[PDB]
């Protein structure tokens, strides 16, 4: 038995166990995650959740399965993922979903990309908080996320835990919830309001909440804290980083530095540190550089997982003793808390 302190104090036993699992596991390995693991790939023949490019490359699925709200909120352009999530959970996999919400202020104007999508930079934070004219639009997205979460059940009728990552890459201005679109306080309010709405207004009990700004080039706790929603509102501390295919030594050092920072903060705050999104012509030493850099650092090695969004390189990463794929993780959801 271990005691866990989550954002949702009434979270299900399996959700609590998932958090406890990562707390233990994170100092013994780094789980491999992949966005659209069993629903998109260059080598798969079925998108039913039974195949993955990862499995075809190394003989096992990723341990962490990433999906986003383009599979949950209308119009669900990426299609539903309930069945694929259930298949992944049945294998003992871990599920994470990131919000990719349309712009609440302009979503009825869709036609010419990127109008009305996440990529429509029209500031929409101020007008979507309570009091704002587009608060009902944002609430409609959150209603759909909650209904989906509330009915996401396994074969015994129990809820499937999900690591829900809200308003990522918020320290850049390419999304409507970005740093040119809101003051730090307004962004914190958007995050907090959304968590509160899901947890308290809609009763979601199977979510862990993740925060994930971009990598910082000035790697300080003060910089990460500027738009941080707060320890009462975040369970998972991550970050997103995309680098160059060539001459990337500096970028890899920055990956390690940001992972070390969130790892140290996570230990101080009782959170789970992760690399929420990492990605990039080809670099056939990319994965070897990634795992070697991370595991050599005493803080960065403590991240629970890294999620990616050349075959020999990846096979070496899989063979590394510190990486963990789906069959390498056990007893994730029935740990006593
Ligand atoms: Zn241990
Ligand atoms: Zn997607
Ligand atoms: Zn992200
Ligand atoms: Zn900026």
Curated annotation (Swiss-Prot):
<dbReference type="GO" id="GO:0000272">
    <property type="term" value="P:polysaccharide catabolic process"/>
</dbReference>
<protein>
    <recommendedName>
        <fullName>Mannan endo-1,4-beta-mannosidase</fullName>
        <ecNumber>3.2.1.78</ecNumber>
    </recommendedName>
</protein>
<comment type="similarity">
    <text>Belongs to the glycosyl hydrolase 26 family.</text>
</comment>
<dbReference type="GO" id="GO:0010391">
    <property type="term" value="P:glucomannan metabolic process"/>
</dbReference>
<keyword id="KW-0732">Signal</keyword>
<comment type="function">
    <text>Catalyzes the endo hydrolysis of beta-1,4-linked mannan and galactomannan, but displays little activity towards other polysaccharides located in the plant cell wall. Preferentially hydrolyzes the larger oligosaccharides and has greater activity against non-substituted polysaccharides. It displays tight specificity for mannose at both the -2 and the -1 subsites. Appears to act in synergy with alpha-galactosidase (AgaA) to elicit hydrolysis of galactomannan.</text>
</comment>
<feature type="binding site">
    <location>
        <position position="78"/>
    </location>
    <ligand>
        <name>substrate</name>
    </ligand>
</feature>
<feature type="active site" description="Nucleophile">
    <location>
        <position position="277"/>
    </location>
</feature>
<keyword id="KW-0378">Hydrolase</keyword>
<feature type="active site" description="Proton donor">
    <location>
        <position position="169"/>
    </location>
</feature>
<dbReference type="InterPro" id="IPR017853">
    <property type="entry name" value="Glycoside_hydrolase_SF"/>
</dbReference>
<comment type="subunit">
    <text>Homodimer.</text>
</comment>
<feature type="binding site">
    <location>
        <position position="100"/>
    </location>
    <ligand>
        <name>substrate</name>
    </ligand>
</feature>
<dbReference type="Pfam" id="PF02156">
    <property type="entry name" value="Glyco_hydro_26"/>
</dbReference>
<keyword id="KW-0119">Carbohydrate metabolism</keyword>
<keyword id="KW-0624">Polysaccharide degradation</keyword>
<feature type="site" description="Plays an important role in maintaining the position of the catalytic nucleophile">
    <location>
        <position position="168"/>
    </location>
</feature>
<keyword id="KW-0326">Glycosidase</keyword>
<feature type="binding site">
    <location>
        <position position="174"/>
    </location>
    <ligand>
        <name>substrate</name>
    </ligand>
</feature>
<feature type="binding site">
    <location>
        <position position="242"/>
    </location>
    <ligand>
        <name>substrate</name>
    </ligand>
</feature>
<feature type="binding site">
    <location>
        <position position="119"/>
    </location>
    <ligand>
        <name>substrate</name>
    </ligand>
</feature>
<feature type="domain" description="GH26">
    <location>
        <begin position="13"/>
        <end position="327"/>
    </location>
</feature>
<dbReference type="GO" id="GO:0016985">
    <property type="term" value="F:mannan endo-1,4-beta-mannosidase activity"/>
</dbReference>
<dbReference type="InterPro" id="IPR000805">
    <property type="entry name" value="Glyco_hydro_26"/>
</dbReference>
<dbReference type="InterPro" id="IPR022790">
    <property type="entry name" value="GH26_dom"/>
</dbReference>
<dbReference type="GO" id="GO:0051069">
    <property type="term" value="P:galactomannan metabolic process"/>
</dbReference>
């Amino acid at each position: 038995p271990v005691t866990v302190k989550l954002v949702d104090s009434q979270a299900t036993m399996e959700t609590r166990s998932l958090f406890a699992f990562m707390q233990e596991q994170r100092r013994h390995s780094i789980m491999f995650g992949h966005q659209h693991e069993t629903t998109q790939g260059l080598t798969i023949t079925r998108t039913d959740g039974t195949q993955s490019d990862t499995f075809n490359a190394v003989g096992d699925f990723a341990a962490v399965y990433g999906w986003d709200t383009l599979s949950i909120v209308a119009p669900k352009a990426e299609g539903d993922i309930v069945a694929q999530v259930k298949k992944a959970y049945a294998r003992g996999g871990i599920i994470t979903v990131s919000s990719h919400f349309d712009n609440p202020k302009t979503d009825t104007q869709k036609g010419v990309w990127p109008v009305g999508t996440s990529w429509d930079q029209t500031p929409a934070v101020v007008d979507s908080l309570p009091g704002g004219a587009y608060n009902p639009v944002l609430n409609g997205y959150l209603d759909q996320v909650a209904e989906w979460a509330n009915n996401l059940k396994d074969e015994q009728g129990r809820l499937i835990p999900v690591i829900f990552r809200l308003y990522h890459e918020n320290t850049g201005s390419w999304f409507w919830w970005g740093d040119k679109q809101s003051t730090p306080e307004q962004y914190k309010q958007l995050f907090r309001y959304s968590v509160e709405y899901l947890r308290d207004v809609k009763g979601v009990r199977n979510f862990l909440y993740a925060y994930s700004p971009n990598n910082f080039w000035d790697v300080t706790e003060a910089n990460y804290l500027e738009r941080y929603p707060g320890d009462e509102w975040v369970d998972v501390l991550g970050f997103d980083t995309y680098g160059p295919v060539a001459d990337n030594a500096d970028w890899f050092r920055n990956v390690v530095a940001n992972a070390a920072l969130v790892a140290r903060m996570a230990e101080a705050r009782g959170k789970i540190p992760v690399i929420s999104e990492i990605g990039i012509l080809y670099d056939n030493q990319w994965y070897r550089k990634l795992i070697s850099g991370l595991k050599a650092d005493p803080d960065a090695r403590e991240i629970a997982f890294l999620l990616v969004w050349t075959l020999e390189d990846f096979q070496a990463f899989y063979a590394d003793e510190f990486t963990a794929f789906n069959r390498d993780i056990e007893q994730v959801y029935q740990r006593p808390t």
